[PDB]
Write an enzyme that holds these catalytic residues in place. Sequence first.
Site, PDB file in Angstrom:
ATOM      1  CG  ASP A   1      60.523   0.559 112.826  1.00  0.00           C
ATOM      2  OD1 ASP A   1      61.903   1.043 112.323  1.00  0.00           O
ATOM      3  OD2 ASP A   1      59.487   0.512 112.327  1.00  0.00           O
TER       4      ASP A   1
ATOM      5  CG  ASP B   1      58.845   5.787 109.797  1.00  0.00           C
ATOM      6  OD1 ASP B   1      58.482   7.154 109.903  1.00  0.00           O
ATOM      7  OD2 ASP B   1      59.542   5.276 109.061  1.00  0.00           O
TER       8      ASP B   1
ATOM      9  CG  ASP C   1      55.796  -0.382 113.549  1.00  0.00           C
ATOM     10  OD1 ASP C   1      56.997  -0.345 113.594  1.00  0.00           O
ATOM     11  OD2 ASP C   1      54.970  -0.149 112.516  1.00  0.00           O
TER      12      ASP C   1
END
Length: 225
Positions: free
Chosen positions: A11, A13, A177
């Site tokens: 990922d 961000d 995350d």
Amino acid sequence: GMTQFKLIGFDLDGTLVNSLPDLALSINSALKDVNLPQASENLVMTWIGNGADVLSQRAVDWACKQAEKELTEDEFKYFKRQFGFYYGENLCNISRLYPNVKETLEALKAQGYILAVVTNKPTKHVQPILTAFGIDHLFSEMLGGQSLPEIKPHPAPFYYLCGKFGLYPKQILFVGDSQNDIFAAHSAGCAVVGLTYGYNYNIPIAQSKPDWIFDDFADILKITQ
Ligand SMILES: [Cl-]
């Protein structure tokens, strides 16, 4: 090498880049332009994960409820244009890479892993933000929120990588995350690292049961040789 993995996906961000400061600054400037109240950075964070349209809808819905106002559709379109503008301007202003991200990606590339980004962030921002942080050259594929018809937590983006690179899902390690990342990986059959420093709706990353839970991006090297 001594692992089963051929490709490592990430990922963007909350995993590679701490973009929340610029996202919050941008969304709050746009809220101000439509005379709506501004949000704390933790609140903005809780809207992130499911693409820029959903982020925009959550922002305006919260602020309108706070202010007991409504926006017309044209005002909402305007808000979104301004938010898009500000963010485009602030892609790499307050934003920074998380600790050891570049060194770790370079190490993994040196070992022969194919590296890919799979994010719900708008596709238009992906190569620019990676270029701004000097890591675009490391990635063989960069998928964003408009790149395919279904996005995380749907496993489709992982299947797309399998097809494109000639892999079984089990040959992909994913690093994220948020539960969007972890659920997509579990559904496709990819091993997944959950990072504890990113954006997950104020929910502990352990709650979605990633295969590993790491506080430091460099720990990925402990599981890749
Ligand atoms: Cl998002």
